[PDB]
Symmetry: D3
Subunit: 241 residues, 6 copies
């Protein structure tokens, strides 16, 4: 219902947009209209955006499709993610825009493929794609990280998320945000960003520490200690305001 609604909004938009812009009309038909569900479209776009002669789009599309088949909820996150960005970003009005044009959104959804592959012990492929993702969209997310749905990577450029990190539902992350890693450890070194959290541009959250639900982290904050539920944190190093 969420997934079908979003898909139908996107199709409805794609018809209007193709009428208005004949330079992109075939793009709208081949990327959205001639497909039958969101997963058909997402796999097409991601495959194109991540293609390389080592593994071209046509062949990569099949890996993505097998992932969607064997874990259908990956596509459902994408639908939440589309709605989340549209809602929270005043610049985004169309349902189709995140799907078509936002590289943070593409990064997130592409990470869901590497996470799947990592859990099937196709680690070498996950790593190959981690890099593609990083090069295509400027976003470095380790395949082993655990990310919920309703996530917004707003202007994703510069985001880094480490192997042990956890991002729960409804979290929002701006450009230049780093999650995790103190100069020290191994075996569980990265933040746990609980649900509803807002993280401002440039913010560095480092270490196995909790950022509690509905916390705001200030722009360019360096967060080294746990942040309580509903708190605001700001400064370098960060203080609870």
């Amino acid at each position: 219902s969420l997934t079908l609604d979003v898909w139908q909004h996107i199709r409805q938009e794609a018809k209007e947009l193709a009428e208005n812009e004949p330079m992109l009309a075939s793009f709208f038909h081949s990327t959205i209209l001639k497909h039958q569900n969101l997963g058909g479209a997402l796999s097409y776009l991601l495959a194109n955006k991540l293609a390389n002669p080592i593994m071209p789009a046509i062949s990569l599309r099949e890996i993505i499709e097998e992932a969607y088949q064997s874990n259908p909820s990956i596509i459902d996150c994408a639908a939440c993610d589309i709605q989340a960005v549209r809602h929270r970003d005043p610049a985004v009005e169309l349902w189709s825009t995140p799907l078509l044009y936002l590289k943070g959104f593409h990064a997130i959804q592409s990470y869901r493929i590497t996470h799947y592959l990592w859990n099937q012990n196709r680690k070498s492929l996950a790593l190959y794609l981690q890099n593609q993702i990083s090069v295509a969209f400027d976003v470095d997310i380790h395949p082993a990280a655990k990310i919920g749905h309703g996530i917004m990577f707003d202007h994703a450029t510069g985001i880094v998320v480490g192997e042990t990190s956890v991002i729960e539902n409804d979290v929002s992350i701006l450009q230049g945000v780093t999650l995790g890693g103190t100069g020290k450890e191994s075996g569980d070194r990265h933040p746990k960003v609980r649900e509803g959290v807002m993280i401002g541009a440039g913010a560095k959250i480092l270490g196995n520490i909790e950022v509690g639900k509905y916390a705001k982290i200030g722009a360019n904050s360096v967060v080294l200690n746990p942040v309580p539920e509903y708190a605001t944190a700001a400064g370098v190093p960060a203080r609870i305001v």
Copy 2:
């Protein structure tokens, strides 16, 4: 004209570079020497760097040239921006380096096309190109933003300029800088950066606030409050100094 003065410096440099670097001689000839004016070299270059099978270089060129044909001051800005970069960056000695090699310069000039397109109601196309610029140059500038001339985007990775921003003439912006947006609004949300301002690397300027003419923002500052003319602001959050 500055355009014609920069153009003639660029041609004179190309001839000598072509002689000294035969690997790149055809590049200098097809990019610069066989074009009558700056517009031709700029339309050729941007079209190449922003090309995609959805809209190849040869086709994009025609859009860029239609923009130059109907708003020629767009090219006059490019020349201002070239001079700005060469003048303000000690590492850039040649007039041609910005045109050929500086991705920050390239993003700005590409934004100018998207701005044009946005004002012609070709908004799908403008969004499509916004994404391309973000992928090609690591710079996110919304087409509706208002940017003047003589602007330098130096090593421009991670720069973000929001829908509602204003950047006046002779402004300098380094890597990691974002303009705008408290998570507080729709309608006019982003900064107005006035003439001659220098914004240091990694600074975040958030809100519908004034950064007054000739101010200096220190590196990694978070500017949440209006900065008076000629002031230096610094720290997270920023204080006057």
Copy 3:
């Protein structure tokens, strides 16, 4: 010999990895298994990654090899860098991983080619490649910067290293880090980062200043003053801790 050791380690892993991932098997063979030494594999990958019609991989590879043949220590640095990454980054377990997949490692080894061309007064070429590195890896390093070996550029996106900079051996630099630049100085404006230094994410180090051996710079710090050996700097601006 570290070079030979690392290379044997990487060939060992490649045969095993080819066995597990048939989708990637030929990639491991043409990249690693059918080359006699590290420099054959390196020149292959970097050429592919920096390829452009202006200078396709097949040409570029020759240039990289001329540099390797006439300056073998470039390759020995690569092996140090590989070991540096593996040992220092917890997420990195295989010796092949840095070689194949990490854009930070690729950008450093690429800079070494641009440094060589700069020193042979082939500066057009060095500048053309600087821009390609910046596009492919989102790492901006001036060809004239002097960088040692045992270097890690961990998740390298947004790293900017200035023309005058020096980075001594065994330095670690994370995403978002800038080296150097203030105002109208020329001729030696950029930091000297000394052996063993560790620069946290988002740090901006500005000016012709010293960062003393084995110092730690905290994340998002702005370093305007020289940093003592074995010291920790944090804050905006940075204070000794």
Copy 4:
């Protein structure tokens, strides 16, 4: 099914071939081994070889696969055609070989798509692909031609088959063969080649004439008159021998 026997044979060769040639191992896996039937492999290959930026492989595959869903005996024909080539060409040993490497086989199978499109009244797409087929394979078949199964287009270079041609089952056609077009007439202008005919290299067969079942046409022969069942025609112009 001939189709399933042929497919089994192709899968069985592909495993052997992948072990023998690690330069090509990934190619055998992405082309054959990771697909579930002959249609998957055929649509993948054809899409790749007819790809253009106007219609990339990944889109083209969708269109080809739709044809296969609507008319599965298009695949059964390919299987028949593979068997034909392997059997009649002594140089062809492997079942995989026609599927992978024979531009005549590819031309025919591609024609089957355009024929389908032509009857679905998508004549623009059909003409577009007729050109792409002509350029990729050097075979010019009009989409309206009627071609049965068991067909071999051996070496196929300069084969031309007119709009009104009929080629029945089990016909063999060598390089440089032209079907049809006398003088000027309109409406039904091209040969009807009957079951089991062998047409030698260079033969030109003009006008709405019957070439009867099991006839042989000699090399470089011009056939202007009907050829009776089991007859051998030869010379310019052709006489029964």
Copy 5:
């Protein structure tokens, strides 16, 4: 103007074709509808079809367009060439078809560019393009040949025209036809095909000899002797009938 009427017919078809086929709609708009005249459309296509990284579409277009500038009769020939193919080929109905899809037409128009280039003493570039034409369309026409207009190369595969050939207006040539060259001469070795001639598939016209106006050459014919006006020639070697 024939040229103007042809162009207007083409646009008119493009409008209706784009409405019928969404997959090709953008192609129609960017190839035809968004261009002012036949010359702009033709330069777009040829550039694209002969593109190579040595000279990309975008660069080559400027050269094609320079030729069109300093000798606009080249574009008029193209317009007759289009009318000829449509009028003489029963299979070709639309004015747009030859422009978009017929490689015989594309080869002819492409040779006109090389002819221009040859006569401007740009012989190295004319030669480069002669090879590109031959690779792209399988038609080998030497730059120094003299071809008039109203020419139809129907299904052009295998056509070979030598350095001294002369083809006058309204000539028709099918697949596999060769013009000229015998037992070693130099200086004027090649046929002079006068106007209104029709040359059947596979015919080979060797030596410096007149093929008289309005003659018909038979398929697979070898014409070693001069052919009188209005005459039919057939056989190998050829004889008047």
Copy 6:
């Protein structure tokens, strides 16, 4: 060495031609002038002309060079072949022209690689390339055919050499020529064409037959019987003359 003489000539032509055509300057430098011997230039050229994502030019180049290194006579044949074409084609005047622009020349040299691959039991790779040659150059020659040196494939469209053929030294072959195969039989089916033979355009020679030294086959001839030394054969079927 013939090799060296040819090489010096070519190098000197490229210097002049580079100076005279700046659009191609870097092409002359990257293809010819920066390589030390003919092998270097050849492997570069052929790698580019046979490249494909399945095996890109950079990897193809290594295979080609391995062959040249382990069997240096292959390069010597190339030089003979350059000389043969230059001498025998009156249109071909420069020594660089064959190396750079003639598909017949390229097909022959590409065949030498497949033949080498075949004789190293790399049957799959040789077959992969057979097809690439056939697509790149419109020439089908089987890797197991035995071809000598001083060969000319003059305008090569449509040439077909069977698996069992033998072409001894100094044979010339025009467009549309076919060697061999009659019908049922295996093991030694194709013609043995001896030293010096000239085969005219369109000639089909079929069966395990001797074409004796310095024979002349006429255009469009079908040769079913043996041809005596110095004899001339012409017609369909061919009679000695």
